Amino acid sequence: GDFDPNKPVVISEFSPKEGGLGTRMLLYGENFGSDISKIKVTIGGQDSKVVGAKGKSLYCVVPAKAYDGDIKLSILNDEGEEIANTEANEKFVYQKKMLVTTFLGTMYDGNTKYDLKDGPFDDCGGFGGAVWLSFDPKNHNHLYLVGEQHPTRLIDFEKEYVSTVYSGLSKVRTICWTHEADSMIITNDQNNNDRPNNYILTRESGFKVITELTKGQNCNGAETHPINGELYFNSWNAGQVFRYDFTTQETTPLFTIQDSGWEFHIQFHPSGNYAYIVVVNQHYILRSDYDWKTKRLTTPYIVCGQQGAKDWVDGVGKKARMHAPRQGTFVKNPAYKGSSDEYDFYFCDRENHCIRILTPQGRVTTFAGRGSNGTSGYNDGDLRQEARFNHPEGIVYDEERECFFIGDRENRRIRKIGYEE
Amino acid sequence: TGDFDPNKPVVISEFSPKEGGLGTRMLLYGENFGSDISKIKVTIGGQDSKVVGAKGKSLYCVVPAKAYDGDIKLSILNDEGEEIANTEANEKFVYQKKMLVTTFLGTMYDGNTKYDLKDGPFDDCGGFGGAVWLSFDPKNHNHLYLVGEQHPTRLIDFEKEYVSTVYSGLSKVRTICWTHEADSMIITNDQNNNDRPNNYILTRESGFKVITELTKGQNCNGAETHPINGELYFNSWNAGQVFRYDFTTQETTPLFTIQDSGWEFHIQFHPSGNYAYIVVVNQHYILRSDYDWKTKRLTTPYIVCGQQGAKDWVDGVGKKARMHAPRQGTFVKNPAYKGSSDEYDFYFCDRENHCIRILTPQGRVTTFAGRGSNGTSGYNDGDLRQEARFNHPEGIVYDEERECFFIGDRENRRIRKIGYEE
């Protein structure tokens, strides 16, 4: 069918009635012509690419942001001017999905270069490192990050500004908070047993006065109990767990995990009933139940992965495989409402370039990454089909903003995972 | 064999199922339980668990309410009920909480035949004459208002745990709605004189106690404001006419007729304000009226569910579903609809079916609660579908902060609650 300029253009029906981004829509009607270049379809105020035209029908692809679902069609001349227009009587029903996007940071010269600077959200350069992410418990607009040899920085959502908190520490691994949040605990990984492993930054000083809390070699992270407030940290040498009491300033060695050279961090469940022990250099996770009577973590047991087996394998418990797991985050799952454990554990699998999910029952799945048929890279979009990370390290779930923030190391950016906006 | 031996140990070897909740029939395996049910005491999560069978090497018990910890203890007793042997299971039972119907407020006396109409604390406020429409104060989530037809407009104050009377005297109060700024409460009166008021305004400045007439009109079955643009929509039963009132110009515009004469209905807007449900109380069906954002008006309605004039109790899609005297509804955010155009379900009272129904955005009607205990009307708390009963439920509100439903259960003179086990 050829377009007739002296005849009206009409939409009789469209299908499917429902869908979202990338849905292949079929539009029935009259006098569309068969030249794709002279047809303009707008869905929800957004341009929709026409992929087929047969005079009485046309195919188009539902674009991103087409939320209103209002369908407009125009027939154009060679110069792109509208010569006929029509509108559908019914609106298309748009279902939003989750996407990986770039929240903060940028690189320039075809993503080969980046600048280390303070500045607004739109002009703050690139992040040297974001290995651990933590919100201020007293201010949900303040998101802190540590970057190993790179500075400790602040992402302020209220002012839309990125600033430097503290510079100079050789290898900052974690951030945790005292029960009253009057202090920030910064953990430094260094080989001298007479030099500090844990530092404190006080709130009253604007986190400018730094204090040595404990001394110790090769500490890969520290974490406070969310109810009783005591600090747990390690030493890589024998893979020993230490308990520090803030009131008595006493350190107690607890158990050893397994063998020498055990690089791990401890992450408590929000109830404080247990912690996951994430062994970064041995590619497996353990669970350590909390003894409320002794106010101590107890002998842990393997929950998933296999000690020393680097791979990407989804499955239950010991059948699962990972490669360099980093920070995790406890996420409230509405499907678990009423159960003993209402949370899933989402974590960065750094050398698998993806985000994994560990359920309370020990099942490991992949949430995001490894899209576009590869592993490492820099790609936004569909969580499993398109999205790619390059050594994701830090991660935090934002319950108020209903999204994830990820420290994507080689891409020098803070990535976001949330529903399209 | 199968008899308890006082000189041998009592132990638990295993139990099944490993998971369940309230009323789960558990099977315990072990040694030396005996076969006398009266001398066996099982405790699950610190709560007494009734033993229903005992065969020496096995027993049956029922998981009680509040057994959340799942720790299992067993004791063998003597004739006087004292513990003579004690054991414990190595594993904890995994308890999954469920929703229950409970009585939140109000009471009746003399075998639920009489009730007192009085102001008082939550524990001693008598019974409710009526709670046909429930509405939270948008500026104070501790203040829950109710209207009761011929009975007074009352306040349920969660902060003070007190029930008070706000206004008395109106013949048939149907609905409550609020001005966009919530400086005023709109109270709708159903009366036959066209020269007498249908809509009253209660100022916040007076604690919602001083009244003023807003509009005049006969047989109005309810009014509702647009949640974004703030204009008022109300009806007239006579021709089933919808009217639009603009607060700034004080101009009433007749909009559209639903169908035929004697159409008793209320209008309830979706939280987005993109559409409203038109609930036809005396014709047992619901319509949807899309909002035209350009003209700032509701438009020509279309049937969403139920069959005009066909009274019944039938779960189903669209016109295959049946109801009998639907009353107030409440929009509840469903986490399963995250990202979709409509994220809410519509829960409503089906007065003469004595239950709570759910209308999904796709037009499916199901039953949420009521009609338990092999009956329809009654007064029973517990399991939503197996035990719970209502008697002419009318008002309903979902409390997002307290994560529960509050229901105006007319003949039971109580405010019922639907929430998870606590």
Ligand SMILES: [Cl-]
């Ligand atoms: Cl892929």
Ligand SMILES: [Cl-]
């Ligand atoms: Cl039943």
